[PDB]
Amino acid sequence: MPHAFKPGDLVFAKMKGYPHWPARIDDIADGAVKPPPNKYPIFFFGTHETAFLGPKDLFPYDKSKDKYGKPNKRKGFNEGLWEIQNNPHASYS
Ligand SMILES: CC(=O)N(C)c1cccnc1
């Protein structure tokens, strides 16, 4: 059975106006801004932007890749696919 989400988990993350997007649950660095309660720090592959989202917007990568892991016109999307598939745990500083 599923656990709760944890840092390092790989997902497709959905925001209003954008396709399901390759992403990871980030850690919070010591001394860094924490998210609101009930929200996770989401790092989006390709764009390298962060947002705070709840589970309703988070689709586990393994289960969803066949639906969602297809090239897309949007800026950074295809880079994002390479990253989630090829080095999803790296520093994208
Ligand atoms: C892919 C991407 O970067 N998206 C969807 C985003 C992330 C954070 C804020 N707005 C949009």
Curated annotation (Swiss-Prot):
Tissue occurrence: Widely expressed. High expression is found in heart, skeletal muscle, ovary and testis. Overexpression is frequently observed in hepatocellular carcinoma samples.
Subcellular location: Nucleus; Cytoplasm
Domain named PWWP: residues: 7-64
Effect after changing residue 21 to A: Loss of interaction with histone H3K36me2
Top-rank taxon, per record: Eukaryota
Signal peptide feature range: none
Oligomer status and interactors: Interacts with HDGF. Interacts with trimethylated 'Lys-36' of histone H3 (H3K36me3). Interacts with trimethylated 'Lys-79' of histone H3 (H3K79me3), but has higher affinity for H3K36me3. Interacts with IWS1. Interacts with H2AX, POGZ, RBBP8 and CBX1. Interacts with histones H3K9me3, H3K27me3 and H3K36me2. Interacts with DPF3a (isoform 2 of DPF3/BAF45C). Interacts with SMARCA4/BRG1/BAF190A, SMARCC1/BAF155 and SMARCD1/BAF60A in a DPF3a-dependent manner.
The protein's role, per its UniProt record: Acts as an epigenetic regulator of myogenesis in cooperation with DPF3a (isoform 2 of DPF3/BAF45C). Associates with the BAF complex via its interaction with DPF3a and HDGFL2-DPF3a activate myogenic genes by increasing chromatin accessibility through recruitment of SMARCA4/BRG1/BAF190A (ATPase subunit of the BAF complex) to myogenic gene promoters. Promotes the repair of DNA double-strand breaks (DSBs) through the homologous recombination pathway by facilitating the recruitment of the DNA endonuclease RBBP8 to the DSBs.
Family classification: Belongs to the HDGF family.
Protein name: Hepatoma-derived growth factor-related protein 2
Organism: Homo sapiens (Human)
Underlying gene: HDGFL2
Residues included from the entire protein: 1 to 93 of 671
